[PDB]
Design a protein around this ligand. Structure first.
Ligand SMILES: Nc1ncnc2c1ncn2[C@@H]1O[C@H](COP(=O)(O)OP(=O)(O)O)[C@@H](O)[C@H]1O
Ligand SMILES: Nc1ncnc2c1ncn2[C@@H]1O[C@H](COP(=O)(O)OP(=O)(O)O)[C@@H](O)[C@H]1O
Lengths: 721, 650
């Protein structure tokens, strides 16, 4: 009663969502009040003012222009701040009371579909997490693509590997979640009510959204813990969008058995997309990525993060890439003009697509027939299958050309989007507007343009499933064409898959180093087999002991993304997990951090695992480090029976081949001719018994007695041993 | 212009052509690359903003001549302008000349008038001198054989051979000083150094186009009269600059709350040149103890003094500005109150320092009368330079006392705040410390620093440091060296009591070197340097020594390095060694004693005690750390089996 009718309406609207900020449309500004005005002034840096106190109560107020809202939304999403958007639904002149305002959408870091808020080559994801005594249910939704996934990771360590791989911009969780260490520090962190994670409500909700009576159609019925998170995520997405989500037409279970399980730590060391420094330079992706479209880059980045294990999918991709290699020069320019179809289709599905997006959609439709013509000559069963999957949609292109001008404006607010004569009534209203060169006829024309603009979505709504299938094939083709182009330019050769685990490489060249090094990369062959599983690496510092191992792992990863390899020939055996340990500096004390990942390597690793221990035995006491690494390799080669490329400074771990089977010493050797040392960066058998250090002692010579005394001591140490 | 450029063709020239000093041909190309000004060949920059571009070029070590006839040559060595000078870092100018007998190295601090000379015996000493001076500019002769030391230095200048003739130098140095014989400064018996001095004096004269009366003396820096720190040791102790190149977490950052930048520079010079004579140190300590009671009163008055030493040199060069004169008159106003506070103090050096500062009351009256139209003010300071010239020698003595007093007061304030106690000097070369506290970490760490005693003697010369990483294995040795260095600067020490023995050289080989000369080559180069130039009076701090890529290879080198350091060199050492095979040295070699910092393990928590004790931890914090975030119990058990095997075989 004390509040004026406009504030009474706002107070109830804020009461619906009191834990999140709200943008309330008034005139041309979204006004924030009281505590919200205070927070906005702190982050958006907008002036905090006070709304005039006609009621008498002070109302702290802040306002931002509607046309520049996206910039403020970007600032909030970086801070992980959820914001609700509310708009005037009724016409204010007709409404005697405050105009009926409703929350149109809730902008949350997870459900941002606006292109302005999305990095082009990075996928945005929304996920929720739930904990049962038995295990954890983790769900993920790519709202920007409609891609929906689910998983049930067995333990806390798996939860961390999944959380880094997904890197969710927003994470939902429950008040009862016990392990708050993993949850804390995540951006856009949300706590939720217990009732949202009920299994029965989820079973009905998922079936209703899909339209399928049984989730058995997607093989998710046997995993209830994950479904509970999915239902909350689906409800949260439905609540955040306030609309149906037809594009989210399927659920998939990401099976640990069907993919290479890379620990979060291995991912940072490989520098797959982001370096240890946090840069996007010297990455495996930049060397492997010269793709024309962002959709292809994201699919490539997803492929890198999720290497597939099934042989059939790999054999299908390689044959296609080899066939496409001849036409790659013709294919790359046409695919560039396709545009961001996957995000454009999701915006169309949400009815939030803009005319510029529609121009790219029709433009992609124009590129499809030429692609079909070039693909028809290519003789491969998958290439023809991809050609069929794209579809024609020529009638829809004709409809779009008829219903949109060739170069449309960004906003439908000012019109001039529909091509003339699509609607005889539209041209009739436009004729009155051009007659002067009438405000009611201008409004009639604009409202008709908006009504037809809604109809354009309705015309394309039935084919949305086919259009989504088309975008899946086009991005899929872009990756295959790029891998062929890179293979032709960087002389990559296809690697055969063999039944037994084991990697054999000939003339192996590390991809990132060879591209970024002016001096030639000296290539080295490597062999891993049931017998050649363990290689101890020794040699001079700055001798690239670390790079030799990185080359093998990146080659092994590339083999499982289905691409060619920077070697004359590669032979690869099935691999379940890739483990990497590199101890370089304190992050827990350095040794504690080194031990934590190593403990994980000692339990998780299995016969199909590839391990890359580096600088192990960095134990502060030489006796202490020697005891742990010597046992760690022995356990890695006695029970785990994994493949390892141990990089060890220790010269006492070079006696392993005599004591243990499967170990083989290999050393990168720097040559010394006269008084000059050279870095060969090449791999040779065994190790340099007389280290470069004695010769280095002669360079910038220490007193001759001192160098002689060392020779006496080195002879004494080896002889006593 | 072509004739003017021909006179100095090896350096850039600013040619006055309106505000824009127009540069042409190759000079225009270089200016476009560095000043980032568009190349049109010709380039130009405004006369009023010349100082900003000069600063950009000086950082790059590019000498520039200024012509209006060349009026002056602005070179990185002779930058007297305050805008081009870091307030708390010394700027120097030096030349180097090579004879078959040895090398002659000269240095001139143009910003103080302090002129020094030396004849280092070999190439390794030249590098130590070059880094200590860090000369922003270095002059050398076309015949110089060892170009490895010269190349990579900023402001590198090649010079004609005739400039390095001994006869011209003997006459030139005598003429500038006005003394018939250089025997008055004891430099006559060192001709190789004098040749460099003459070129440097001529170069300074050529660069300024004027006489240099402030340069009234030359001194021979005798290796016997100072502690000789090698270039590498200086980078590791982070005395003024950290390994990262920052000015943070430095011994200077903790020891420097000086009220005037001159005091910081004098402190930095004292740190860079520790004195060996006991009398100068006993004089300083008695003064600091007497000042400790009045430190609170002394600090505010000394802050108002200003940068007198650089102001006097600018006054001497006739390049001082009125803002500097306001600080000079202000310092003159502060002197009587200082004399009043110092008069009550009962100490022989404090009264001697009081006499050295003097009154200069007539000069203060003249300055108050002559300072509160740029041409009129410029005329005024030029007149003032002439008036203050006869007393310039006394004023230079006054700035030496004022900066010296600021250092003693700052050290007393630090002593009062951080409970520093004076260290007595002993004839025998041994360092005994009680409740020793490392200065930097106790001043940047929230949790309490745990202090530890250390003993070094003719018998306790070598200490092997072992124990956990992140256990301050490195910090303990750094604490002793910084204390030993601080004892020879004459300051109090962060401990209950310190006893110090005479030290000729401080050598350090800090570890963790992963920068490419390969890393191991750089590592042995500094070790080779120590084992050739170390003596009985040397204090050595090998750290992470024996980081040979092959553990067997590194073990032979470090084990031998220690044996040579304790059989012939007989120096004092604080070896920090990861190797647990160097813990057997006390049985094998006399003079070695094991000391270890051990993080304790009680229940499921590790505590960083940072406490020093005799012996070493056979069971490392790592076996306990293996239990935390536990590896499979069999794996940790297998390490115990191996740890028992490794120690038992030894
Ligand atoms: N095969 C190679 N051919 C040529 N240069 C190489 C090769 N491998 C490495 N390098 C170079 O040598 C350097 C070695 O650095 P790094 O791999 O960190 O050495 P280490 O692992 O021995 O410490 C690399 O930065 C790279 O420039
Ligand atoms: N007495 C002390 N008590 C607690 N922490 C300390 C103490 N002395 C130093 N530290 C802290 O512990 C750290 C140990 O790391 P670091 O000095 O790199 O180890 P190390 O000297 O073995 O290389 C120091 O950097 C400092 O932050």
């Amino acid at each position: 009663d004390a509040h004026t009718p406009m504030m009474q309406q706002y107070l109830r609207l804020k009461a619906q969502h009191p834990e999140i900020l709200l943008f309330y449309r008034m005139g041309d500004f979204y006004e924030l009040f009281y505590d919200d005005a205070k927070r906005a002034s702190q982050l958006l840096d907008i002036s905090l003012t006070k709304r005039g106190a006609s009621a008498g109560e002070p109302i702290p107020m802040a306002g931002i222009p509607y046309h520049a809202v996206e910039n403020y939304l970007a600032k909030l999403v970086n801070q992980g701040e959820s914001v609700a958007i509310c708009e005037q639904i009724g016409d204010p002149a007709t409404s005697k009371g405050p105009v009926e305002r409703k929350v149109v959408r809730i902008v949350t870091p997870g459900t941002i579909s606006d292109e302005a808020l999305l990095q082009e080559r990075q996928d945005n994801l929304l996920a929720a997490i739930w904990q049962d005594s038995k295990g954890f249910g983790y769900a993920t939704l790519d709202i920007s693509s409609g891609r929906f996934r689910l998983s049930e990771p067995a333990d806390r360590e798996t939860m961390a590997a999944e959380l880094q791989r997904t890197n969710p911009a927003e994470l939902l969780y429950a008040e009862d979640f016990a392990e708050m260490s993993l949850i804390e520090g995540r951006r856009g962190l949300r706590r939720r009510p217990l009732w949202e994670f009920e299994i029965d409500t989820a079973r009905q909700q998922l079936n209703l959204q899909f339209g399928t009576r049984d989730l058995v159609g997607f093989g998710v019925e046997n995993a209830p813990r994950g479904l509970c998170a999915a239902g909350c995520l689906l409800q949260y997405a439905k609540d955040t969008q306030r609309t149906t989500l037809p594009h989210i037409r399927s659920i998939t279970m990401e099976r640990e058995q069907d993919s290479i399980i890379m620990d979060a730590a291995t991912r940072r060391n490989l520098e797959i997309t982001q370096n240890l420094a946090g840069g996007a330079e010297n990455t495996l992706a930049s060397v492997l990525d010269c793709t024309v479209t962002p959709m292809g880059s994201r699919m490539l980045k997803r492929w890198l993060h999720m290497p597939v294990r099934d042989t059939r999918v790999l054999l299908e991709r390689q044959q296609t890439i080899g066939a496409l290699q001849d036409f790659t020069a013709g294919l790359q320019p046409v695919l560039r003009q396709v545009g961001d179809l996957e995000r454009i289709l999701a915006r169309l599905a949400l009815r939030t697509a803009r005319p510029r997006d529609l121009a790219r959609m029709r433009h992609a439709f124009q590129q499809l027939p030429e692609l079909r013509a070039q693909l028809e000559t290519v003789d491969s069963a998958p290439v023809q299958a991809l050609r069929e999957k794209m579809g024609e949609f020529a009638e829809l292109r004709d409809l779009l050309e008829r219903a949109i001008i060739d170069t449309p404006p960004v906003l439908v607010r000012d019109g001039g989007v529909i091509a003339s004569g699509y609607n005889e009534e539209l041209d009739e209203w436009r004729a009155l507007a051009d007659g002067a060169t009438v405000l009611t006829s201008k409004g009639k024309a604009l409202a008709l343009e908006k009504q037809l603009y809604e109809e354009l979505f309705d015309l394309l709504l039935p084919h949305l499933e086919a259009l989504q299938q088309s975008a899946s094939a086009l991005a899929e083709l872009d990756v295959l064409v790029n891998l062929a182009e890179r293979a032709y330019t960087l002389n990559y050769t296809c690697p055969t898959f063999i039944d037994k685990p084991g990697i054999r490489i000939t003339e192996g060249r590390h991809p990132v180093v060879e591209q970024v090094l002016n001096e030639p990369f000296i290539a080295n062959p490597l062999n891993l087999s049931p017998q050649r599983r363990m290689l101890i690496i020794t040699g001079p510092n700055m001798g690239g002991k670390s790079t030799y191992m990185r080359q093998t792992a990146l080659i092994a990863l590339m083999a499982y993304i289905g691409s060619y390899v920077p070697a004359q020939k590669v032979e690869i055996g099935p691999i379940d997990r890739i483990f990497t340990r590199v101890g370089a500096a304190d992050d827990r004390s350095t040794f504690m951090v080194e031990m934590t990942e190593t403990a994980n390597i000692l339990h998780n690793a299995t016969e199909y695992s590839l391990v890359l221990m580096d600088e192990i035995g960095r134990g502060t006491s030489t006796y202490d480090g020697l005891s742990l690494a010597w046992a760690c390799a022995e356990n890695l080669a006695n029970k785990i029976k994994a493949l390892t490329l141990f990089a060890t400074h220790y010269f006492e771990l070079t006696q392993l081949p005599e004591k243990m089977e499967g170990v083989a010493n290999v050393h990168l050797d720097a040559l010394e001719h006269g008084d000059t040392i050279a870095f060969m960066h090449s791999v040779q058998d065994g190790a340099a018994s007389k280290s470069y250090g004695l010769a280095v002692a002669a360079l910038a010579g220490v007193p001759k007695e001192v160098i002689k005394r060392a020779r006496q001591k080195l002879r004494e140490l080896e002889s006593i041993s």
